[PDB]
A = this chain, B = another copy of it.
Amino acid sequence: DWSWYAPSELVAKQIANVPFNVLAGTPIKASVHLRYDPSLVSGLKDQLFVGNNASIMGARLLYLPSFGISTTVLDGLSMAANQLYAYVRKSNSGAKVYEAPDLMMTVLAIQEAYRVLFEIRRAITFANYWNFWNKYLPKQVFEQLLAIDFDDLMSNKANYCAQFNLMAQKINTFALPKYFKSILRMAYVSSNIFMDSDAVTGQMYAFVSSGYYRYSATTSESGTSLVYRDWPVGAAMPRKLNRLFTVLRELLDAIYGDADAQTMFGDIYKAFGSDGLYSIAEISVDETSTPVFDVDILAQIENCTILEANAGLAWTLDSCNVTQSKGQVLLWQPTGTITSSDNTEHIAGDIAVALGDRVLNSHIMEPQYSDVLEWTRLMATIEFDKASVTSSEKVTFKVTSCGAELIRNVLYFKNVWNDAAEDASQRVITYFSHFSQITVTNATDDPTSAYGLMSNTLDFTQLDWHPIIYVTETSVHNVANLNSILIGGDLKRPTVITTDVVKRINSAANYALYYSANLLSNIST
């Protein structure tokens, strides 16, 4: 009780008055006094350390759009493709024109097209959110969290809005059944920005597609297929919007160039009414959305799994395309390669990592199956291909399973200050810091040593709900002479899931995203 430290209320209202005028992006000039013997310390000069780091801005979740590891006809896509082509032939008659996969493929292409368009919606809808208290916001966030040239967007807010609504109308002419619960997902995921707390001065997370998908018509060998090219994103130039459109252009030029294409849409319309197709609402220069505080989404994160488990290493990713088997089964399963940050070709003396049996943390005492399902699929599993490996080789791996979005890497930003510096543009640098999910005791934020695995700058704790950090300890450091692992993260009601269990659930969850039981249940004689 505060009443304890003051006589009358009125008197208290006067002795504790402290200003919280230290805006978001400004530096936290906190000080630590020091005392040592100058002749025994390498080069440290003063004996007073004034801070110059602002509270962390937030974190960028670079994800790979996913349909859920697909290897058998049982998996998500293949199944949906099935009931879909059905519902369509249902209303049609006569000669066959296109195979089932070739159709379903087209649909996805359209979905992934909207993915891009949506991130663009996000881009504009948020171009006007300003909240005095947080200087990061307006701009900075776009630059780092979304990877979008704010100045360019702000300066052309008019034309960009228009070019958008144009898209919305033009894409509306590309059939797409509004029943696919998967849409609702990606839509929500890349349409907002989430807060780690009900406070604006708090840090915030954002999801960002690391790429897109164009349709690649039946060449001569590979039957029709869906190609994936990378967003040139991670630590490069913070892309202007004209690049996001010029890509969408390319994206539909693909979906459209297929001889069968059009006649497909028609057949689709004949199946579901205009009321059965998705379409986004147009927006005005004034539309402004707000950061949101979704507990569930945070939880999804805290639990998730980072593919690039430790930024100290060099990661790769191939075979991300979506093909169709000789027997009409839709296939997708990304494979990658883990190598050392020095000899980009070998692994040498470094150690590859991926977690199997992982933790699951509930922020509710009595959790329930319902909450489990939701708080999961954001976490995935990686399996190594080879039994064991050599210093001269590469570490090969397949992705056994995962959720709707595959978390590739995660970066948290904060700008460091330095008033009085030559170039004005550089008195405030917005530096990033890699977030590694798996690490080791006695690790340093310098790749250089520690078997190739770096630790995380303790900054990260600023992110309430940050994903679980798993630290490995040699039998040496452990109090039980046996080596195990230490857990990091705000635990409340934790529990463990098997690599096997996770596989199960995702292999299932995704199936749901692309299926509707209601669909083939009301068709009469």
Contacts and interface: CB of A to CB of B under 8 A. Distances in A.
A50 interface: no
Interface residues of A, number: 154
A285 B238 contact: no
Contact of A73 (B249, B282, B287): B249
A96 interface: yes
A395 interface: no
In this complex, the member of A85, A170, A262, A273 whose beta carbon has the largest number of chain B beta carbons within 10 angstroms is A262
Contact of A329 (B85, B175, B253, B281): B253
Interface string A256-283: 1111111111111111111111111111
B90 A271 contact: yes
Nearest to A117: B248
Given A241-B148, A262-B82, A524-B273, A88 B268 contact: yes
Interface in A71-89: 72-74, 76, 78-79, 82-83, 85-89
Query: Which 5 pairs across A and B sit closest by C-beta, in order of nearness?
Result: A89-B266, A94-B94, A257-B327, A95-B95, A175-B268
A412 interface: no
Contacts of A264: 98, 103, 106, 175
A308 interface: no
A474 interface: no
Contacts of A138: 79, 82-83
Given A244-B116, A245-B120, A266 B86 contact: yes
Contacts of A118: 280
Given A91-B267, A169-B515, 16 more contacts: A74-B166, A86-B127, A93-B93, A97-B263, A100-B263, A109-B251, A113-B252, A114-B278, A116-B247, A116-B248, A120-B244, A127-B288, A156-B241, A162-B508, A256-B328, A274-B523
Contacts of A154: 82, 85-86, 89, 100
A317 interface: no
B167 A245 contact: yes
Interface stretch (A178-186, A346-354, A455-463, A496-504): A496-504
Interface stretch (A19-27, A128-136, A198-206, A293-301): A128-136
Interface string A381-412: 00000000000000000000000000000000
Interface stretch (A2-10, A139-147, A419-427, A439-447): A139-147
B109 A288 contact: no
A368 interface: no
B260 A98 contact: yes
A517 to B, nearest CB: 7
B93 A280 contact: no
Given A253-B329, A260-B98, A264-B175, A155 B89 contact: yes
Contacts of A96: 95, 97, 155-156, 260, 263
A491 interface: no
Contacts of A281: 168
A125 interface: yes
B157 A89 contact: yes
Q: Which residue among A86, A92, A164, A517 has the maximum number of chain B CB atoms within 10 Å of its CB?
A: A86
A86 B517 contact: no
Interface in A232-256: 238-242, 244-245, 247-249, 251-256
14 contacts: A89-B269, A93-B501, A96-B260, A98-B264, A110-B255, A119-B244, A142-B238, A148-B240, A153-B240, A161-B284, A165-B282, A169-B282, A175-B277, A274-B523
A92 B149 contact: no
A257 to B, nearest CB: 3
B521 A274 contact: yes
Contact of A267 (B92, B166, B244): B92
Contacts of A249: 72-74
A235 to B, nearest CB: 10
Contacts of A273: 523-525
